[PDB]
Amino acid sequence: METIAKHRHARSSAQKVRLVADLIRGKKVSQALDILTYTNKKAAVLVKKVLESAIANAEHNDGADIDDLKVTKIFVDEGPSMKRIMPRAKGRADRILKRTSHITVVVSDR
Amino acid sequence: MKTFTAKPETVKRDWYVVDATGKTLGRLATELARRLRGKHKAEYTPHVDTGDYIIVLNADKVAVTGNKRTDKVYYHHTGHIGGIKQATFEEMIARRPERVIEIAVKGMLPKGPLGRAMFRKLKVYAGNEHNHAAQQPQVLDI
Amino acid sequence: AVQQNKPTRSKRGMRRSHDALTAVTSLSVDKTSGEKHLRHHITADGYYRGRKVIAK
Amino acid sequence: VTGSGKKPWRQKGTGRARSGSIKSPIWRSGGVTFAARPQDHSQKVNKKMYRGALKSILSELVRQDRLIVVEKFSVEAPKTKLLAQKLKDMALEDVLIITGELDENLFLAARNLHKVDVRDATGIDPVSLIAFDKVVMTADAVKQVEEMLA
Amino acid sequence: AAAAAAAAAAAAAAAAAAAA
Amino acid sequence: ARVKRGVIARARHKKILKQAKGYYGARSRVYRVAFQAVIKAGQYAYRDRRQRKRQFRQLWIARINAAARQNGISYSKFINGLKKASVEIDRKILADIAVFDKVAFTALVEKAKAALA
Amino acid sequence: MYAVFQSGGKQHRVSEGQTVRLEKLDIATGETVEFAEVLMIANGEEVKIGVPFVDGGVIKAEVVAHGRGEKVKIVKFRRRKHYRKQQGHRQWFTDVKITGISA
RNA sequence: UGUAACGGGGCUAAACCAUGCACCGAAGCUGCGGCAGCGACGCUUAUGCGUUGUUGGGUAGGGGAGCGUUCUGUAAGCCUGCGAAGGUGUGCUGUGAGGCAUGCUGGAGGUAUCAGAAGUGCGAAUGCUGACAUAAGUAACGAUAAAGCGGGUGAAAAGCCC
RNA sequence: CCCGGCGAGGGGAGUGAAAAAGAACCUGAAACCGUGUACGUACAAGCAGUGGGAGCACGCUUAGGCGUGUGACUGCGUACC
């Protein structure tokens, strides 16, 4: 169809989420969902949930096929960084970020 | 004001064959570099490829006169340890006569790429035989 | 040591060339389990070549 | 400043800042080095420049025929529909209605409409002539305007 | 959404002068 | 009477950066190191503006040389022949007219070999 | 199709019937200006001359407007000093259309 | 550290000396177009012009001219929801600072001109604050007192409950 | 209503003139970081740009050898304060 997908405020290391867009970038659906669940990373099962929801709108929100959907664009943008502190040591503290993402899957036509 | 320019489809590459026996070291190479540089022909300018194939004959009978048959130094360094690999005209003729022409042209040609394209045009052989007569070298022994 | 100078964007993406997960082509079919399963492991119903290993 | 001299470093030993103060003007708190306050802005200007102006400015309205002497423009009652018609019928607007004479219904009524304000012969100044182009005065007003100025 | 962040100002020196 | 320093900052930056495009890496991105870059840029433009008329006054000479060489005489001897001929100096750029007609050039050559002679 | 002529700060070859945009000289928009300082003929028939000038020919051309140049930014800059000068220059231009070699 | 006491190749004349001729070569000089400063000469009036001479590398530094920004005046005046400012792109334009026109965004205020006043122009102060990089997916994950299984729940159990 | 863990969050659906107005919510720049498309780039050394300049994609240059974008190669060129 054309449907987007975001999971905003994904807590997850963003250089790692970028790696797994690539993994299944433009390689249809219904095996790109399977790979993630049988490969490494729990980034796998975080972008996976975004994936099966994108699909589910490409169903219910117009559609009726997973037979003609290719995962056209898939990225992930840097999300709001979670400011915190680390007592680093010897009377020195540092803002230490719990880095974050906006997981974005965009399935379209095949 | 505006000019013709070169293009590598607007320069027809050519085969030439040049002597080496009556010819004299570095004065054979200025004839190579000359041709290479495209100031033996109609062109725009050296600023792209202007090479055009050309072939020496021997490399064993190029004159080096008496006093550089005596020793003409050739230096090389291998970037290791104490290094240093040294050869003379003579030791080269032992060890691939071809090299006395490759080193000549190298320092009479600029930097990398366009000299290194312009190494491919020049061929270097030892002995006056032909071995590639089939892509029609046309005489220019002179 | 403690570095000097700021690496360029290029120099990042150059290391991250080699970073990626191996595409195993994970899904596969047996004639003992037509499931869409990862090979040389569980089918998710215990099988490996048939034969349920799972009791959970 | 509402700050204090507490020093955010303990001299060199660390290199966070060379500043000794949080009462600096370059701080987040600020301070500003040439901060605004009470300042005077009143100039002298001679009495002969003062008159001098209102004589050139007078004798410029004349050359630009826009100075009008009309009498008995005083109003009988507060009601500005009478001070409308007074200007209107004489095809005037943008007025001063400047006279030394005393009619208080005239001062009061002039306050409404911002294209006219209360002006007096004795209160005279440049800027008010200049802006409010038609210039309205009684035969008595001019006679007094002479002694006041020149 | 609380925040707390201080600044640090303590020494990292421990090493001693060369050639007095 | 606080003045907020216009938007005049990243507006006068906005010029530079748009005229500073096309550049590999942070050389265009960063305002500091796209200003010490923009300087150097202009400096070179102004430099080479005069080097145009050098590098061409090498390019020309070069090729006039080759032309004449193949025919008769040397460069030296040539040019001093358009000279010895008089109004027909023909410039150096437009001394070369041999690109689309060698014989156009060759006429000057032969004419000039007799002026010299 | 050559025959060069004095164009002032430049000289120019003939291209015959084809427009050339050259350094500004003179003349209002419109109007023909002729270059009888032509000093080579060789219009493909290979009619060589070597002598000063060509007497009896002109190079006619029509001015299809003139106009300003175009801007390129002149910085004169010396590092380690306190010195920059910025300076804009844009020239001017004569155009010719060319109609010459007319006898 | 390696030729490294010809720039290099290379050269036995391409060396070296003498002579001569030719050519190359700069932002020099000349040509051409155009600009500005001062001086002068004519025309000529706060005038300003043309003509001509000559000049215009420039820190410290002096002088002389301006732009722009925010504000107040000129302003229930003008411009604007039939779309202002700002943002973001382009064209045109000026010697420049910049300006002008305009498309997109935007959803409201902004302001010719002339003059007046300034918290009036920023890359640099280990400047200050705030944001986000960088090293990096590196270091480390806080004790060398080891955990392992099987259930249970739950969507998910190496770590939890039993 | 749907996906998901009666999740979070998001997508729809409506609300609304606007939801790139959705609560981290005005306008939302810049740094910074992606994705796409076009073009370039894996034998070539150096303030990375600049002048020249081949090839390529676009606007056809809508007849014309042109402009826009990019820049192989090549002549230059040792950052700013």
DSSP class per residue in D21-55: -SS-TTSSS---TT------------HHHHHHHHH
Q: Is the CB of B79 under 7 A from strand I?
A: no
Question: Considering only alpha carbons, which residue of chain E is nearest residue D7?
Answer: E9
Q: What are B40's two structure tokens? A: 């033996």
Smallest Cα distance from G75 to chain F, Å: 6
Question: Which residue places its CA closest to the C1' of nucleotide H92?
Answer: G70
The b/e string for B46-82 (b: 16+ C-beta within 10 A; e otherwise) is bebbbbbbbbbbbbebbebeeeeeeebeeeeeeeeee
Tokens 């690496």 sit on residue: C7
Return the residue in F55, F60, F99, F102 with the most chain B beta carbons within 10 A, the one to mutate for interface testing: F99
Chain A residues whose beta carbon lies within 8 Å of the beta carbon of residue E6: 93
Name every residue whose Cβ is closer than 8 Å to that of residue G39 and which is 6 or more positions away in sequence: F87, F88, F90, G4, G5, G6, G52, G53, G54
Q: Is E8 on the interface with A (CB under 8 A)?
A: yes
> How many helical (H) and strand (E) elements, i.e. helices and strands, does chain D have?
6, 2
CB F87 within 8 A of CB G36: no
CB F45 within 8 A of CB G73: yes
E strand or H helix that includes residue B85 = strand B85-87
CA gap G29, G22 in Å, rounded: 14
CA angle B107, B111, B117 (to 5 degrees): 95
Q: Has A90 been labeled as part of a binding site? A: yes
CA angle D118, D122, D124 (to 5 degrees): 65
Decide if E10 and A83 are in contact by the 8 Å CB cutoff: no
CA gap B39, E6 in Å, rounded: 73
CA angle A42, A45, A47 (to 5 degrees): 105
Grouping H, G, I as helix, E, B as strand and the rest as coil, residue A102 is strand
CA gap E2, D141 in Å, rounded: 74
Domain map (residue ranges) of chain F: 1-117
Q: From the CB coordinates, do chains C and B have 3 or more pairs under 8 Å?
A: no
Q: What are D138's two structure tokens? A: 């009684």
- Strand H: which of residues 76-115 in chain F lie with Cβ below 7 A? 76-77, 79-80, 83, 92
CA angle D107, D91, D56 (to 5 degrees): 70
CA gap E3, B69 in Å, rounded: 85
Question: Which residue places its CA closest to the C1' of nucleotide H10?
Answer: B26
Distance from residue B79's CA to nucleotide I42's C1', rounded to whole Å:
25
Chain B residues whose beta carbon lies within 8 Å of the beta carbon of residue G10: 1
CB B63 within 8 A of CB B26: no
Question: Which residue places its CA closest to the C1' of nucleotide H14?
Answer: B27
Nearest to A17 by CA among A52, A66, A51: A51
Q: What are B67's two structure tokens? A: 């006093």
Nearest to B23 by CA among B58, B56, B63, B72: B63
Count the domains in chain B.
1
Distance from residue F40's CA to nucleotide H129's C1', rounded to whole Å:
33
Nearest to G96 by CA among G19, G17, G5, G6: G19
Decide if E7 and D8 are in contact by the 8 Å CB cutoff: yes
Count the domains in chain C.
1
Nearest to B100 by CA among B28, B33, B36: B28
Nearest to B15 by CA among B46, B45, B43, B56: B56
Q: Is C1 on the interface with A (CB under 8 A)?
A: no
Structural domain of C46? 1-56
> Please, what's the largest Cα pairwise distance for chain D?
87
Name every residue whose Cβ is closer than 8 Å to that of residue G4 and which is 6 or more positions away in sequence: F90, F91, F94, G11, G12, G13, G14, G38, G39, G40
Question: Which other chains touch chain G, taking contact as 3+ CB pairs less than 8 Å apart?
Answer: B, F
Grouping H, G, I as helix, E, B as strand and the rest as coil, residue G51 is coil
Q: From the CB coordinates, do chains C and A have 3 or more pairs under 8 Å?
A: yes
DSSP state of A8: E
Handedness of CA D122, D126, D131, D136 (dihedral sign): positive
Tell me the CATH number at A82. Answer: 3.90.470.10
The residue type of A109 is D
Backbone dihedral region for residue F60 (phi beyond 0: left; psi -120 to 50: alpha; all else: beta): alpha
Name every residue whose Cβ is closer than 8 Å to that of residue A1 and which is 6 or more positions away in sequence: A57, A58, A61, A62, A63, A69, A107, A108, A109
Nearest to G12 by CA among F51, F90, B125: F90
Q: What are F50's two structure tokens? A: 């005069």
Q: Is B1 on the interface with G (CB under 8 A)?
A: yes
First to last CA, chain E: 53
Q: What are B38's two structure tokens? A: 């495209």
Count the domains in chain G.
1
Grouping H, G, I as helix, E, B as strand and the rest as coil, residue B139 is strand
CB G38 within 8 A of CB G53: yes
Question: Considering only alpha carbons, which residue of chain E is nearest residue D13?
Answer: E11
Return the residue in A35, A45, A47 with the most chain C beta carbons within 10 A, the one to mutate for interface testing: A35
For A61, half-sphere exposure in the C-beta direction (CA atoms, 13 angstrom radius) is 13
Q: Using CB atoms and an 8 Å cut-off, which of residues 28-67 of chain A contact chain C?
A: 31, 34-35, 38-41
Structural domain of D40? 1-149
Decide if B39 and F93 are in contact by the 8 Å CB cutoff: no
Nearest to B76 by CA among B66, B90, B86: B86
Decide if F99 and B42 are in contact by the 8 Å CB cutoff: yes
Count the domains in chain A.
1
Grouping H, G, I as helix, E, B as strand and the rest as coil, residue F1 is coil
Nearest to C16 by CA among A13, D74, B127, F13: A13
User: Could you give the residue ranges of the DSSP H alpha helices within E1-20?
Assistant: none
Long-range CB contacts (within 8 A, 24+) of F21-25: F25/C8, F25/C9, F25/C10
CA gap E2, C9 in Å, rounded: 34
Resolution (A): 5.8
- Strand I: which of residues 35-74 in chain F lie with Cβ below 7 A? 36-37, 39-41, 44-45, 47-49, 51-52, 55
Q: What are G56's two structure tokens? A: 């009896």
Q: Is the CB of G87 under 7 A from strand H?
A: yes
Backbone dihedral region for residue D96 (phi beyond 0: left; psi -120 to 50: alpha; all else: beta): alpha
Grouping H, G, I as helix, E, B as strand and the rest as coil, residue F26 is helix
Closest Cβ opposite residue F102 in set B1, B39, B42: B42
Phi/psi of residue F23, nearest 5 degrees = -105, 120
Q: Is the CB of A78 under 7 A from strand I?
A: yes
Return the residue in B1, B2, B3, B30 with the most chain F beta carbons within 10 A, the one to mutate for interface testing: B3
Q: What are G95's two structure tokens? A: 């155009």
Count the domains in chain D.
1
Nearest to B11 by CA among B44, B55, B35: B44
CB D150 within 8 A of CB D55: yes
DSSP state of A40: S
Rg of chain G over Cα atoms, rounded to whole angstroms, equals 19
CA gap C49, G18 in Å, rounded: 83
Name every residue whose Cβ is closer than 8 Å to that of residue F68 and which is 6 or more positions away in sequence: F74, F75, F78, F109
Three-class SS of C1-56: CCCCCCCCHHHHHCCHHHCCCCCCCCEECCCCCCCCEECCCCCCCCCCCCCCCCCC
Tokens 């080096």 sit on residue: B64
Q: Is the CB of B6 under 7 A from strand I?
A: yes
Strand-pairing partners, residue A77, are: A102
User: Can you say how many angstroms the Cα of residue A23 is from the centroid of all Cα atoms in its chain?
Assistant: 11
User: Can you say how many angstroms the Cα of residue C3 is from the centroid of all Cα atoms in its chain?
Assistant: 35
Phi/psi of residue G20, nearest 5 degrees = -140, 145
Phi/psi of residue D68, nearest 5 degrees = -125, 130
Q: Is the CB of B47 under 7 A from strand I?
A: yes
Q: Is D9 on the interface with E (CB under 8 A)?
A: yes
